[PDB]
């Protein structure tokens, strides 16, 4: 449990990288590529039905990739079908949300969506202004932690692999996986000098 | 195709009745059982996260029952796995919405939700006031058609079994199912003297 834990970090990070939808360098570069008023207006003039379809498609894709990420964690495939589903039900949306913070630009308060960056107003046709502001505020406050890629990988791993979830058959097995991931997270934070973030999550 | 079509109506209606979540008589009776201010306030004070969980659970249940209804239609099981999924993806939410009109009371503008009736304000914590009003307006306008149970059964059947859906392997097979359901719908409307509704949907 020294080279074993160092392989778990390498593994979690690789599983994350190969199941992240977008490469970070493209997300950062594309910050300058902002939707015009004309384009934003095009999205706002879409019917409530059309927009919900579009946005539901993207969410579904995002969740699929989170499933692929979960399957890639050591031990996740060894859980009974009930537990796999429970952990994904309790964890997926939180992982999508943390993953989305990468696509959020706190400087101008925009997100990457369908190839360009735009603000909350993009989603006006959905009729969820309050919900969308709360999603943006979450991203905003999470972006102030300046999470590295490797940190997202390890942290989203711990979000999914949570033994406290209601409905779980094998609490003890999940506890072991969780514990190994906790060791992995805290180890990588020690070597990178980033222990300070533990207090503020 | 006279006793055959009369058996299809009986069949569709029975499949609907055994996959409707709530009996209509209970829905109508429970119209008088309205949430108090105290109870409505309890829902509004729930966090955005808590309410979304609750409402997502109910939606998921509603969709499950719509799946059971689809499987119960003659020919639906005979479609390849791709087509089954396509038709459910394109149709489910529309069926949920039509089914929900039964739980909507146009007289006081309330819906049945978790055991009592309440208005739009129940869902304030979700942050989707615009979306929720559009759902209520849909129910409102649909409730003015005064759809019988048998009519919902046959109409929701035609919503799902639509050959025009993008992504379909066996367009010709779905066309045959659709056509039989169209015959069944129009037949039942003839015998019940309710041809007038065809113009206004
Ligand atoms: O390409 S996206 O679909 N763009 C995007 C970026 C931000 C948002 C939305 C969509 N949407 S959406 O409805 O089309 C899909 C969506 C994404 C995330 C969430 C979240 F609440 F779980 F975070 C909900 C819906 C509205 C909420 C904010 C995307 C999805 C996941 C991700 F990690 C990054 C993304 F850019
Ligand atoms: O017991 S319900 O869950 N109560 C109910 C009645 C009306 C609504 C909601 C919930 N919700 S919800 O978010 O908790 C579940 C939901 C139900 C229907 C739809 C619809 F848009 F597809 F119609 C969306 C969400 C908000 C929209 C209006 C229910 C679900 C389906 C149904 F056909 C009848 C119901 F009463």
Residue B180 structure tokens: 């039989």
Q: How far is A127 from chain B (nearest CA, A)?
A: 4
Ligand 2 atom nearest the C-alpha of B123 is 26
- The answer to whether the beta carbons of residues A153 and A181 sit under 8 Å apart is no
Mode of pairing for the β-strands spanning B116-118 and B104-105: unpaired
Asked if the Cβ–Cβ distance from B128 to A133 is below 8 Å, we say no
According to DSSP, the residues that pair with B116 across neighbouring strands are B113
For residue B56, which residues of chain A lie inside 8 Å, CB to CB? none
- Rounded to the nearest angstrom, the minimum Cα separation between A133 and chain B is 9
**Distance from C-alpha of B71 to C-alpha of B73, rounded to nearest angstrom:** 6
User: Is the CB of residue B35 less than 8 Å from the CB of residue B122?
Assistant: yes
Of ligand 1's listed atoms, the one at least distance from the Cα of A135 is 21
Distance CA B129, CA B147 (A): 27
Q: Which helix (H) or strand (E) holds A127?
A: none
CA B197/CA A44 separation, integer angstroms:
33
**Nearest Cα residue to A131 out of B112, B125, B25:** B125
User: Is B47 an 8 Å CB contact of chain A?
Assistant: no
Residues 6 or more apart whose CB falls under 8 angstroms from that of A201 comprise A145, A155
How many A from CA of B95 to the centre of ligand 2?
A: 11
Q: Which ligand is nearest to the CA of B52?
A: 2
CB proximity A127 to B under 8 Å:
yes
Q: Please give the Cα distance from B119 to B133 (Å, whole number).
A: 10
Q: Which atom of ligand 1 is nearest to the CA of A99?
A: 33
For ligand 2, atom 15: residue with the closest CA? B59
Residues in chain B: 201
Among A88, A100, A102, A134, which is best to mutate for testing ligand 1, by the most ligand atoms less than 8 A from CB?
A: A100
Question: What CA–CA distance (Å, rounded) separates A113 from A96?
Answer: 14
Q: Does the beta carbon of B134 lie under 8 angstroms from any beta carbon of chain A?
A: yes
Q: Do A131 and B134 touch (CB under 8 A)?
A: no
Q: Which two tokens stand for residue A155?
A: 């942290």
Question: Does the CB atom of residue A87 touch ligand 1 within 6 A?
Answer: no
Q: Which residues of B24-54 are buried (b: 16+ CB within 10 A; e: fewer)?
A: eeebeebeeeebeeeebeebeeeebeebbeb
Angle of CA points B52, A123, B86, to nearest 5°: 70
Whether ligand 2 lies within 6 angstroms of the CB of B106 is answered as: no
Q: Which residues partner with B34 through β-bridges?
A: B117
Pairwise CA distance, residues B55 & B68, whole Å: 20
C-alpha–C-alpha distance, residues A14 and A6, integer Å: 12
Instruction: Report the C-alpha gap between A109 and A117 in whole angstroms.
Output: 9
For residue A63, count CB atoms less than 10 angstroms from its CB and return exposed for 0-12, middle for 13-18, buried for 19 or more: middle
Which runs of E-coded beta strand occur in B98-174?
104-105, 110-113, 116-118
Q: Which residues contact A64 (CB under 8 A, 6 or more apart)?
A: none
**DSSP annotation string for A17-47:** HHH-SS-HHHHHHGGG-BPPHHHHHHHHTS-
Q: How far is the CA of A109 from the centre of ligand 1 (A)?
A: 14
Is A48 touching B (CB cutoff 8 A)? yes
Residue from B113, B136, B147 to probe ligand 2 pocket by mutation (most atoms less than 8 Å from CB): B113
Cβ-defined contacts of B41-48 (< 8 Å, 24+): B43/B118, B43/B122, B43/B123, B43/B124, B43/B125, B44/B121, B44/B122, B44/B124, B44/B125, B45/B125, B46/B125, B47/B125, B48/A130, B48/A131, B48/A134, B48/B125, B48/B126, B48/B127
Paired residues of A105 in beta bridges: A110
Rounded Cα distance between A18 and B93, Å, is: 33
Q: Is the CB of A59 under 6 A from ligand 1?
A: yes
Q: How far is the first Cα of chain A from the last one, in angstroms, to the nearest whole number?
A: 26
CA of B69 relative to ligand 2 center, distance in Å: 17
């Amino acid at each position: 449990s020294l080279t074993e834990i160092e392989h778990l970090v390498q593994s979690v990070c690789k599983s994350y990288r190969e199941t992240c939808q977008l490469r970070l360098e493209d997300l950062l570069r594309q910050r300058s590529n902002i939707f015009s008023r004309e384009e934003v207006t095009g999205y706002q003039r879409k019917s409530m039905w059309e927009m919900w379809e579009r946005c539901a498609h993207h969410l579904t894709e995002a969740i699929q990739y989170v499933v692929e990420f979960a399957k890639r964690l050591s031990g996740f495939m060894e859980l009974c079908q009930n537990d796999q589903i429970v952990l994904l039900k309790a964890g997926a949306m939180e992982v999508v949300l943390v993953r989305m913070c990468r696509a959020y630009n706190a400087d101008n308060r925009t997100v990457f969506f369908e190839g360009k960056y735009g603000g909350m107003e993009l989603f006006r046709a959905l009729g969820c202004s309050e919900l969308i502001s709360s999603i943006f505020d979450f991203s905003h406050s999470l972006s102030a932690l300046h999470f590295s890629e490797d940190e997202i990988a390890l942290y989203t791993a711990l979000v999914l692999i949570n033994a406290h979830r209601p409905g779980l058959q094998e609490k003890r097995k999940v506890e072991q996986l969780q514990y190994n991931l906790e060791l992995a997270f805290h180890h990588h934070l020690e070597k990178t000098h980033r222990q300070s973030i533990l207090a503020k999550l």
